[PDB]
C-alpha cells in the first residue's frame, strides 16, 4: 500500500480500499461506499472528498464496461466490422505490402492422405464465414462480400518423403518460406491460400497464409486445433463458436450505444495526459514515424526461462506482468523518464462466449509505468498489475489498434506511445545448463515502412520450454547508440530482476 | 525486494542484495574481495562495485571493528566512573531541582510476605550488584566514583491500614507511593537509591523504591523486580548469573580507548555529517533539541487493536517493533513533509548471553535513516528500515548518540540533531501494564491524556515517542517539546501517528464483522 493516497492513481485508491473491506459505488450520480464500521477513516473520508470528481469518472467507466455475458445473436447484415475499416483506411493498398499482413500456417499431418487433409481445411473455410471475406470500394465506402467455399482454389503439389531428413527438412523449409513471401494483396479476391505438399500417399504438409486482417494469432491456433481433431480417427467433436460476423455486428452496436460515453471519454482524458519519450542520445520524438523495421531476435533457452517463471512465482504474478515490468524499468532507465506508457497487446476472447471465435480480436491495454529510482523491482510490479487489471476491465475495441488520418474519439490512434508489448503464451508439442547472458541475438534485415511505424515493439512468446523474442526498432528513428543502449537495458533488467532471485573467492 | 538503480543504495542495502544472491564481501588486506558462485557476480554488479569501491571498503572496515561476541569481561575490575556516567554528569549537572527523568520508581505488593522478609530481600540485590551502591563526587573537578556499604542502606517502615475498604485503601496506597517518587534523589547524593516497605499488615507488604536512572535503566528494573521474586518465593529459586555493571565498565572503557574502533567511529561520524534537518512543518524552526516544555501525550492501545497490529507485523514477516518505526517514520515523514526522517531508536546493549541479567545502565542508540517518498509503498520502506535497523545495531558504540556534550566528543556522541527518538520494549509480567480491554470494537484513535509541562532549562529531546508492549496492551507516550512545536504541529503529528498505526498495521483485521452502505 502506497504512503500518499491523495497521489496514487484511482485504480490504486480503490484497490487499496478494497484490500481493507471498502468498496465503493455510483448510482444516480450518487457516491457512496460499503464497509464494516468505522473502516472508512476520516483521512479515507477527506481523500474520497477531494478525489470526488476523478472516482465518480472512473466509475462511471466502469459502469460503461463490457461485462459478461456478451450475447451474440444472428445478423442478416454483412458489413466491414470497425475494426477492419480501421485497417482497410489506414494501411491502404500499396504496391508491397507490409509483411505483418500474412500469417503463415505450416503444419505435418502424418498418416493424413493430402485429399482428406485439403477437404478438411475447406471444412473450416465453409464454416467460419470471415475467412471468405472479399473487400473492395464503392463511392469511399468499405464493403465486404464473401466468396464460395467451393472456389477456393487449393493447391496441390509433391515432395520426396523418403529423402533423409536433413535433406527433407531444409526443402520443406524453403517451399514453405517461399510460400509465405507472396503477397496477399488486401483488395485481392481471396484473403487465404492453402497448398497441400504431398510427401507420400499418406504424408501431408499443409502450407497456408491467412490475412491478417481477418485472422489473428489466436485464431490460428484455433484452425490447428479444429485441424487436429477433424483430422483425428476417429473425428473429435468440434466445439461451438459463435460467427466473427455476428459478433462484428454485436460491436457495433454496442460501440454506437450512448451508454459508452464514459469509458471513452475516460481513455480519452488519459490519453492527453500521457508524457512523450524522446531518444536518449537525440532528444527526437519517439512518436510512431516512417522508417526502417529492424528485428533482433533472441530466444531465452529452457534452464533460463525456468529461472524467470520461478523468480515471477517468488513475486506472486504471472510471468507476463515480470516481464512487462522490467520492460518497463529498461524503457524508464534507457530513456531517462521515470513515467513510461507501455501499449499491451491483448486478446478480447475473455469470456466463454468467445472462446472458439474465428476472426480479428486483437486489443490493447495502454498502462503508465512509474520508475523512480529509488524504487525496488516488486512494487513497481505490484503497481503495475493493478494499471493492468483496471486497463483489461476497462477494455474497447477500437482503443489503441490501428492509426487514424481523421476523424474519431481521442483513442484510436496508437502513435504517440513509442513502446508497445505483445507476449503470448503456446501449448502444443535445449537444455544447457550453460546458456550465455546476454542470449545470442539476431538482426534481421530493414523493412521499409513508408508509413508510421511502431517506435519499439517487443513481442514475446512463449512456448512452454523456451521463450522467443524479437525487439523490431524504427532503425531510422533511433540511432544504432541508442539501439544498443536499449538493448543493454532491456537483457539487464531481465538479468537483475527475474533471473538472479561451487564458491569462489576473487580479489575485485 | 530489490532496487532499481543499485549505484545509489544505501552500502547496507547494498549488501544485502548481495548476500540474496550468495555473494558476500570482505575486506582483507585492505583489499576488497568478493566470495560468489562462479557466475553469479554480473558485469553491472562489477561496474556497481567498483564506482562504489572507496565507501564499500569504509563500511567494511568499520564491520571489522564492531563488537564481537563473546564479550569476556574480567571480574574485579578497579572502581571508577563508567564512559557513561562520565556523559551524564558532565551534560545534566546538578540543577536545584532535577529532572524527573532522573527517577525510576518500584512499586511492587508482596503478599503474604513480612516487612522484613521484603526489606531483606532488597538489601541483598543491593549488597549483590554493586552498581547499586555507587556514590558520586568530585576529585580537582575529576569525577569519582565510591561505593556505600549495603548493611547502611536505611530501609524505611511505616504502615498503611490494610483494613480500610478498597476504595479508601487503594487511593491511599497510590498517593503514599506518587509521594515517595516525587522526592528530589539529588545525582551527588549518598545513595543512588532509596527504599521503604508500606506495611498493610503484618505479612502484607508493599515495596517502594525510586533508583537513579544515571545507574539503573528500565530493563535493570525489571530484573530487580523478577530478582525480588525469586528471592522471596517459597521456596527460593535460584538466582541467575550475573556480571557485575563495573566489570562491564571497565571492559568497555578498554574497548573504547583500542585503536581498532577509530573505523566504526569514522563511519558514524561521517553518516552523522550528513544527516538532514527536519523543521517545523508550521513555524520552519529546527527541530535540533533546544530549552523547553516537556508535555507527555499518552495512550493505550487494548487488546483487540494490539492483535490486529501484531497480525499485520506477522503478514509482512516482521517483528512489531519494525512495522511500529516504520509507521513512525512514514507519520514523520508525511507530517514534516520531509521525506528523509533521521530516527534515533533507543535499544539495549543486552544483546549476548555474558550481559543478560547484568544489573545496571546498558541503554544505547541505533540511528537510522527512513526514506518516504510519497510514491512508496509501506512494505518497501519496511524491508529497507529492517536492512538499515540490522547494520546500525551491528555497528554499535555505546557512547553514541546518548547524552549530548558541552565540550569535547569525536562528532558520534550528541544526539541534539536528531528531533525524533523512539524508545520500544517489551514486558510479559502478569497484571502489569494498563488495565486489560477485551472489547472486540474498542474505538479509535485511542483516547488521549495530556500531561502538565516540566521545565527543562536544558536541550530538551523535541519528539520522543515511548511504546511498552504488554501483552494484552501497547501503552504509549508522545513526549513533546511544547515551547518548540505549536499546538497545531503537536495535534497533527499525533494525528498523523495514529493515521499511520490506523492504515498500515490496524486496517483489514474485521474477521467478517457487519457490513453497512453509507453515502458519501
Redesign the interface.
Known sequence: ????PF?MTIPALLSELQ???IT?SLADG????????????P?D?AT??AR?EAIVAYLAAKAARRTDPVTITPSAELRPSLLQELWWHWYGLPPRQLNQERLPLVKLFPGVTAGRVAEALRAIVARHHTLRSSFHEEDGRLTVTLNEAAALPIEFVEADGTLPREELEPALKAQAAEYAARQLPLDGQWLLRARVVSLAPDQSLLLCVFHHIIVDAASLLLILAELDARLADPPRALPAAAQFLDYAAWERAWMADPARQPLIDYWARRFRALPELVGPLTGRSLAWQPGSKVDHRFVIPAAQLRRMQAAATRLQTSLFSALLSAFG?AL??WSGSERVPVRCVGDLRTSPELANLVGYLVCSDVIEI???????????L??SEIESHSAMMLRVPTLMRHPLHRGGSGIEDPRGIAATINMFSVRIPDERADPP?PPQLTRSAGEPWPIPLPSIYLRLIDYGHALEGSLELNDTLLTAAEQAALIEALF?AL???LL?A???????
Do not use: C
Request: aromatic share 8%.
Open positions: 500500500q502506497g504512503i500518499d497521489t484490500a481493507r473491506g465503493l450518487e457516491l457512496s461506499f460499503r464497509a464494516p464500521k468505522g473502516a472508512l477513516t483521512a473520508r474520497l472528498s470526488r524499468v524508464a532507465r512509474h520508475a523512480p529510482a529509488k524504487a525496488d523491482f516488486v512494487s513497481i505490484k503497481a547472458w539487464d538479468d537483475r530482476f538472479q561451487p564458491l569462489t573467492t576473487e580479489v575485485l
